[PDB]
């Protein structure tokens, strides 16, 4: 550990169940004053898939979106939200923090599950 211990973010809830077509939301509370970190939203598969992130990535085309990440006023907790949830949106979700150095180092939270009924 030359650099310095940097403790990972968190997720909630462990199991979130929303009806289909409805809106689901997870809360990631991550705090670091030092340096520059970017938050990322993920869902896995039989294997990272990047859904949203904050600051909001505008780099790739594809206009609107379902998945979005936004910081809450207290400036610690963040809102991870899928809107208009399908049936196949179910799966293992998670969040992670990422630094801005070229050799950037990433740490992820403890994965949570989402369920879509109906």
């Amino acid at each position, epitope marked *: *550990s*030359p*650099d*310095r211990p940097w403790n990972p973010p968190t997720f909630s809830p462990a199991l979130l169940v929303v009806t289909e077509g409805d809106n689901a939301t997870f809360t990631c509370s991550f705090s670091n004053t*030092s*340096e520059s970190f970017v938050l990322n939203w993920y869902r896995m598969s039989p294997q990272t898939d990047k859904l949203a992130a904050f600051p909001e990535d505008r780099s790739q085309p594809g206009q609107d979106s379902r998945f979005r990440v936004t910081q809450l006023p207290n400036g610690r907790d963040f809102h991870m939200s899928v809107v208009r949830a399908r049936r196949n949106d179910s799966g293992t979700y998670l969040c992670g923090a990422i630094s801005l*150095a*070229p*050799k*950037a180092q990433i740490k992820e939270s403890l994965r949570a599950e989402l369920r879509v009924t109906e």
Partner: antibody
Amino acid sequence: VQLVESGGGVVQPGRSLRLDCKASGITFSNSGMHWVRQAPGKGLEWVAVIWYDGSKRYYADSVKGRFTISRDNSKNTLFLQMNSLRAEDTAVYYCATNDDYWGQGTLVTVSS
Amino acid sequence: EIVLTQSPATLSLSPGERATLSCRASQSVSSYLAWYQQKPGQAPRLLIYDASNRATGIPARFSGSGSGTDFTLTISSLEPEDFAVYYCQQSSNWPRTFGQGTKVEIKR
């Protein structure tokens, strides 16, 4: 968002010299630091490393007992003490964080 | 010290051509190998760390592979900017050791 080095140039053999590397627009105090030189016209060679707090430090065999690497986290300055310099120690010394932010490089020429 | 051998010495290509550079270790560093870019009169530029992971703000055409002993940096569509000298580096243990470097040369 930089690392500016200092304390270079020409020095006779056996005479000491001391490099200074002052980082900016980052968090220096929490990153680890490195020293990498390169002889002119030849490839890079790792020199020394210091853990961010200073709990531990490792050197290159070529520089043991001679060079000394340290850091003053207050002033956000990396220090390199180069003693008993030999003509072979001629090189360009860059400082870099472990996360790989590198500076311009400082030139040290050892000749009599 | 671990001995990293880079092959070839020089590589003569043109813009758009594939570029594959090899690095062989006297030992095993696992995935702790890194790759740097250097143009004349400049500082080293990180490209690929941990043999797969690409550095931030680094073009997608740049990539890497290999594990254990042998590793390969790759440039898919070469670009006039990419002509430079390339060194690898191992973070496995101490002392951190670079290679002699491979030079990517303009082919005419």
